[PDB]
Design a protein around this nucleic acid. Structure first.
Ligand SMILES: [Mg+2]
Ligand SMILES: [Mg+2]
Ligand SMILES: [Mg+2]
Ligand SMILES: [Mg+2]
Ligand SMILES: [Mg+2]
Ligand SMILES: [Mg+2]
Ligand SMILES: [Mg+2]
Ligand SMILES: [Mg+2]
Ligand SMILES: [Mg+2]
Ligand SMILES: [Mg+2]
Ligand SMILES: [Mg+2]
Ligand SMILES: [Mg+2]
Ligand SMILES: [Mg+2]
Ligand SMILES: [Mg+2]
Ligand SMILES: [Mg+2]
Ligand SMILES: [Mg+2]
Ligand SMILES: [Mg+2]
Ligand SMILES: [Mg+2]
Ligand SMILES: [Mg+2]
Ligand SMILES: [Mg+2]
Ligand SMILES: [Mg+2]
Ligand SMILES: [Mg+2]
Ligand SMILES: [Mg+2]
Ligand SMILES: [Mg+2]
Ligand SMILES: [Mg+2]
Ligand SMILES: [Mg+2]
Lengths: 82, 129, 123, 80, 205, 156
RNA sequence: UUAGCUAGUAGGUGGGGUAACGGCUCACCUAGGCGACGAUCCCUAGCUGGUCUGAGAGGAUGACCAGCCACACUGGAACU
RNA sequence: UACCCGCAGAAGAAGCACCGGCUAACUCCGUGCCAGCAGCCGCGGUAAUACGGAGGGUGCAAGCGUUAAUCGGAAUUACUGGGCGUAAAGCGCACGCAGGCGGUUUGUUAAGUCAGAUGUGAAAUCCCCGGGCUCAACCUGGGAACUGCAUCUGAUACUGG
């Protein structure tokens, strides 16, 4: 089914995750439909390490796409910052 | 056969200048008039004049500065064997802007500089330098 | 030269053949020495050029120059050619690598030692 | 507004089917010359109403046959 | 990955001083600066145009102590960057950290400034920097840290820097042993004997 | 103040009853660091006499070149007998990108930023003639303004 | 220094068939269809985003990464 | 684990090619058209800067050379950007179908052409401005670009109808 999930595109030992919309049978870093942001766990101070287009995310959820556990965590952290 | 009058016009100019001819005459046309209009406005010939009704003869009065010719180089670009059309971004700069490129546009025949200021390109007749 | 002529028959390029065809786009090929011998060079030179007839691995039978002074090359010897022709020899297009798999380095050579497979002479 | 094309009719011998030469006019990708290129399409016609040398206007539809996926709408320049 | 041999042999080949030694003793005393090194050093052959382009590039390399792959990458960056390519090449060489240490006089030579960098004696904006080729942005402070502040060779290098000409684009405070890279230097701020066009023509075959 | 460069020396011959008589030719070019450029071609039994005859003829027969600040004014072409030559104005400090004899003639011409290419035969005599013809017929915005009878601002 | 190729072939009617159009299949009818803008045949070959070079136009190429296709001892077939 | 602090002492850490011209860098001793070099021109026959060693020097540098392979230089398949009297190259001549091209004027069309808009041209890559790893390589944000195609709205000089 269609899902919303991370995609490991970083260097070794220094990850960086593109949060994308993908059919769940595809590979992780492979084919996707729409890139709706990113997350950096090694994000320094004075930079964004989380950016999510929540209107598109709510658009795909209105289409019935599922959300990963980490993406739903990052939506929580945005809805706690805001 | 006479496949191309515009290259005949340019060749009669080029050989007139090289022969130090005062004036050059030729069978007239609506386009040959519009080109001599451009060459008069930009300053390469003194004056043109078309006379006659059934078969009109266009006479060009050439221009000489310090003895030698004004028109250093004049060339045909688009030809019946190979047409040349350019967009407004890819219009050429002859001699870094010193020469001109006679361009036929939808709003009549103009130079490349006026074609850029008009924001529209067309068919490149000749490079005049 | 007419643009119509080029439309009908375009400008075709020149497929350049390789002067080392036995390598088959490889840098080196292992061979077996068939006959080790000498050859007199062209007329302006005069020497006894040390050159071996080699059955290669891919099946070809090519001749190959033996560089340097002195060689322990015999028949039924397993060498490694690398490509590169001797100008002053008819038909020799390849060089044996000195210091490879049967061939020894040049005795008592102290300059250009890697071009001849010679270890660093410790003082 | 629907997409349609025009062209000469090459042949009409097979029934309920004509062959149409659409002659497109493209620029050469290298030398800049404009070259006429001809495209043949098998066009379904009802009633066998077209002739050779006839100009026609066709649209694309669902595949009627193996080599036929085009249907005319009207005829211009009927005669020779 | 560094030249470790004799330095005046390089200055003799280039024909002029490269400031490869501290300048306490005069270089004409320490070496025959007018004679090329080697057995055949007295003879001056007619040096070719490729020769003068090589000697100019080897001059600038032997001044700053940069090897060829890195000097090539500086040429690629200076040609990529806008404006004069040779001037951007000199602005990057003057932006090197061991050069800024030399120009502030914390080390007597550029090599000694390099050794202070390599031996963790330099803080850039508070953080210790170990790399000689660290680019120093304008409006950057650069200081001797606390532990190597009590070195003898530091205030001896500041003595020789007081003997030397003051650069305009810096502002050093020798008591705290720190300074401030205010701006990148102009070509007019630098030396006038460097023909940077010979290097551009060399890497523009 | 006139900088002087010899481009190439060449030994020529002349066969007589006794045998071959050898001689030397010298191709030198002078210039003032500005548009005043001039070349010479001397020939003698000896090299310093040939360079001196070449510098002598090069100091006269100078030619004037309407330069810009340090570069050319428009992309110009020059031919002489084997050597079609293209040269082009370039950005500041890109150097003289030119081949052989053209580097020496543009260096004494006082140009500093060119993009050149010598097609055809690269014989230094004809290619330095082709560059002298290209720089000589390179024309300014003032000369084209007076020629067409307009202002420079009307020419842009 | 491959010029002719094609009888399910090209099209039509109807039946069957498929998730679906359709010679996809079958009977019947017509005699067509492709081709010098290169059919057919032969050799080679996975394609692209791209990569290398080159001032550019171009040339060569398709490793890694990503998209499509194909195969899974070889040749076949179907089931769920 | 990164990272940081301390200890001890210059210790434990430089090689490869080349030096006749192209091509940066020269002398000596063996050697004798032998041994050998070699990318091309070419060196070697008793004073070899060209062979082999040494001293010196030059270029690179934890690499340096050789070989294979691609583009370049090569405007040497030339669209950009070549030629054909004698250097390679005008069919022995002509008619002529297809094809290519086409005098001048007006009207009309809007196909080509030009302009604008929309959709698309996956991401990555390249480029620009930045950010992050002590710097860089690298990773990364945004943008530009993807020079294309389709549709629509217009323009009518030129070409075509
Ligand atoms: Mg955490
Ligand atoms: Mg390194
Ligand atoms: Mg730059
Ligand atoms: Mg004379
Ligand atoms: Mg030539
Ligand atoms: Mg049936
Ligand atoms: Mg049915
Ligand atoms: Mg295959
Ligand atoms: Mg090129
Ligand atoms: Mg199987
Ligand atoms: Mg030399
Ligand atoms: Mg001797
Ligand atoms: Mg040699
Ligand atoms: Mg080539
Ligand atoms: Mg080419
Ligand atoms: Mg030719
Ligand atoms: Mg003959
Ligand atoms: Mg002939
Ligand atoms: Mg004839
Ligand atoms: Mg007409
Ligand atoms: Mg019209
Ligand atoms: Mg249109
Ligand atoms: Mg448009
Ligand atoms: Mg993209
Ligand atoms: Mg940074
Ligand atoms: Mg019309």
């Amino acid at each position: 089914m269609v899902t919303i999930r991370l995609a490991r595109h970083g260097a070794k030992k220094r990850p960086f995750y593109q949060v994308v919309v993908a059919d769940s049978r595809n590979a992780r870093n492979g084919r996707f439909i729409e890139r709706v942001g990113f997350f950096n766990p090694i994000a320094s101070e004075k930079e964004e390490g989380t950016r999510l287009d929540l209107d598109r995310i709510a658009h795909w959820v209105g289409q019935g796409a599922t959300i990963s556990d980490r993406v739903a965590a990052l939506i929580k952290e945005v809805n706690k910052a805001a | 056969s006479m496949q191309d009058p515009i290259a005949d016009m340019l060749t009669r100019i080029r050989n007139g200048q090289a022969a130090n001819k005062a004036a050059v005459t030729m069978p007239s046309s609506k386009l040959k008039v519009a080109i001599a209009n451009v060459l008069k406005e930009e300053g390469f010939i003194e004056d043109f004049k078309v006379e006659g009704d059934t078969k009109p003869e266009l006479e060009l009065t050439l221009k000489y500065f310090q003895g030698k010719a004004v028109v250093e180089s004049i060339q045909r670009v688009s030809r019946p064997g190979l047409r040349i059309y350019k967009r407004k971004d890819e219009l050429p700069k002859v001699m870094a802007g010193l020469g001109i490129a006679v361009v036929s546009t939808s709003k009549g025949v103009m130079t490349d500089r006026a074609a850029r200021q008009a924001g529209l390109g067309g068919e490149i007749i000749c490079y005049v330098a | 030269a007419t643009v119509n002529q080029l439309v009908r028959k375009p400008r075709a390029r020149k497929v350049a053949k390789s002067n080392v065809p036995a390598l088959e786009a490889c840098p080196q090929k292992r061979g077996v020495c068939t006959r080790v011998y000498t050859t007199t060079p062209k007329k302006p030179n005069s020497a006894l050029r040390k050159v071996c007839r080699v059955r290669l691995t891919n099946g070809f039978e090519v001749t190959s120059y033996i560089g340097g002074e002195g060689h322990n090359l015999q028949e039924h010897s397993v060498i490694l050619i690398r490509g590169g022709r001797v100008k002053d020899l008819p038909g020799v297009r390849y060089h044996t690598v000195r210091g490879a798999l049967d061939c020894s380095g040049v005795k008592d050579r102290k300059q250009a030692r890697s071009k001849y497979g010679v270890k660093r002479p410790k003082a | 507004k629907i997409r349609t094309l025009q062209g000469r009719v090459v042949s009409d011998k097979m029934e309920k089917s004509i062959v149409v030469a659409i002659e497109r006019f493209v620029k050469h990708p290298i030398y800049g010359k404009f070259i006429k290129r001809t495209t043949k399409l098998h066009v379904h016609d009802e009633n066998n109403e077209c002739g050779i040398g006839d100009v026609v206007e066709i649209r694309e539809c669902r595949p009627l046959s193996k080599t036929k996926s085009w249907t005319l709408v009207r005829v211009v320049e009927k005669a020779v | 990955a560094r030249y470790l041999g004799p330095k005046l042999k390089l200055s003799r080949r280039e024909g002029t001083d490269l400031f490869l030694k501290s300048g306490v003793r005069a270089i004409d005393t320490k070496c025959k600066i007018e004679q090329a090194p080697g057995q055949h050093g007295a003879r001056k052959p007619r040096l070719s145009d490729y020769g003068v382009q090589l000697r100019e590039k080897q001059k600038v390399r032997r001044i700053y102590g940069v090897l060829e792959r890195q000097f090539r990458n500086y040429y690629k960056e200076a040609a990529r960057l806008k404006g004069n390519t040779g001037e951007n090449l000199l602005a990057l060489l003057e932006g090197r950290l061991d050069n800024v240490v030399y120009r502030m006089g914390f080390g007597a030579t550029r090599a000694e400034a390099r050794q202070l960098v390599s031996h963790k004696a330099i803080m850039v904006n508070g953080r210790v920097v170990n790399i000689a080729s660290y680019q120093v942005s304008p409006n950057d402070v650069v200081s001797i840290r606390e532990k190597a502040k009590k070195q003898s060779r530091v205030k001896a290098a500041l003595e020789l820097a007081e003997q030397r000409e003051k650069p305009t684009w810096l502002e050093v405070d020798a008591g705290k042993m720190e300074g401030t890279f205010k701006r990148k230097p102009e070509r007019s701020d630098l030396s006038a004997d460097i023909n940077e066009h010979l290097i551009v023509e060399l890497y523009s075959k | 103040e006139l900088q002087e460069k010899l481009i190439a020396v060449n030994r020529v011959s002349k066969t007589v009853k006794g045998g071959r008589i050898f001689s030397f030719t010298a191709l030198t070019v002078v210039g003032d660091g500005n548009g005043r450029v001039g070349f010479g071609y001397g020939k003698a039994r000896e090299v310093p006499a040939a360079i001196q005859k070449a510098m002598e003829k090069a100091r006269r027969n100078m030619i004037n070149v309407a330069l810009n600040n340090g570069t050319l004014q428009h992309p110009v072409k020059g031919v002489h007998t084997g050597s079609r030559v293209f040269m082009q104005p370039a950005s500041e400090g890109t150097g003289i990108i030119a081949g052989g004899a053209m580097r020496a003639v543009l260096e004494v011409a006082g140009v500093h930023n060119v993009l050149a290419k010598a097609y055809g035969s690269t014989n230094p005599i004809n290619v330095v003639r082709a560059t002298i013809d290209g720089l000589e017929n390179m024309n300014s915005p003032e000369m084209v303004a007076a020629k067409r009878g307009k202002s420079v601002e009307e020419i842009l």
